[PDB]
Symmetry: D2
Subunit: 126 residues, 4 copies
């Protein structure tokens, strides 16, 4: 579940919440990509949210180098399973991650069938 | 149609959206209040949103004086009518109307059974 | 800080996030009221968010009986201190809390100077 | 003024709001894409939001066929222009345009340096 391509002080964590039910979004698949040298998206890490709606251990401090990363949340499969025909195919969060500043990231996403918000971070990890 | 009290160049407008169905929240009750000297809420204007999810002609420029206002939105009757169990009793937006600031105010509300956003203002008009 | 009128399995917790800075909202004063028998708001508990943007220990399982509670977040003082003139006087969350179902509550609030969202819960506590 | 490609009864419209200043996001670049057979994104329509934060006449009913669309919003250049350091590279909305569904689509985006919401649809018109 909440795991991926690494284990460290958790430089990248994802938390998904369900705005219709008032609970975390469990079993939401997440795919992380890194912008490759040839400008394409290279697959970086993936997992699914736990019963807490969280995704941990996706990567590691060493592996998480500067770059443009795309965090893709499969919202569609999530609503489908619930009996709902959602509007979005998925929710994507694209950002630059460096060395030069903030180096631990909490990407949060609040889900509604026709809407979603996404917000980012704190500082060290907690 | 769906109007409040006074009709003319709208200094205050309300718009409500349904994030579950992806459409405007139609026929929603909104009640506006002004804090009186003894700090109690005196009814100011009221109305129900139209088929477009908007409420206009609530008040007028001469009537809308500086002060503290409360826009209360009956969110619960809305979800009940749809058969979804909601969390909130209602949504509220409390703000100070200040002359040296913008004249026109659009209070936007995006609704979910367990969550809501509220955003405000602009200046010239539509 | 994150404390109030009780200590238990945390039936009521509050977390505030800053959407402009990407961090938790620290030192945000929170006031909780309970609808009184005579239909007025009786003060119930209060505190301020910690460095994590969270508020714990506000109440206790025994003290937190069925009722309509109003959670008031002093967003205005928060932005003022930051050098910003916000739009809202505060952010309020009004809901019924029972015995008959969900009995642990996490009220979260994401803050912007002219906007704010609020969402509620999970189930047991975590 | 601020238009995309084809002009007439708008099957797709975009509106962007600034949650920091409480006004429309003016002069924002939006690029629309259609997934092609080989699953690559082919440019479909583009434009900059007007003084009202809207983008109209992007396409036309005859042109807007069923398929998967991507609306990319240049959020970063927006915050840079204001001098605020943002988190996201840009905002994206990926969705399937399906005939048996509504015809008109308004993609609404509410922006903050570290957070964004996106909501959709209605049906008849304005």
């Amino acid at each position: 579940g909440p795991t991926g391509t690494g284990e460290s002080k958790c430089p990248l964590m994802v938390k998904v919440l369900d705005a219709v039910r008032g609970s975390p979004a469990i079993n939401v698949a997440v795919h992380v990509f890194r912008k490759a040298a040839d400008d394409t998206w290279e697959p970086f890490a993936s997992g699914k949210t736990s019963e807490s709606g969280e995704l941990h251990g996706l990567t590691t401090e060493e592996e998480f180098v500067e770059g443009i990363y795309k965090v893709e949340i499969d919202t569609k499969s999530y609503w489908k399973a619930l009996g709902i025909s959602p509007f979005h195919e998925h929710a994507e969060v694209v950002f630059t991650a460096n060395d030069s500043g903030p180096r631990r990231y909490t990407i949060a996403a609040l889900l509604s069938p026709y809407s979603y918000s996404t917000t980012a971070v704190t500082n060290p990890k907690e």
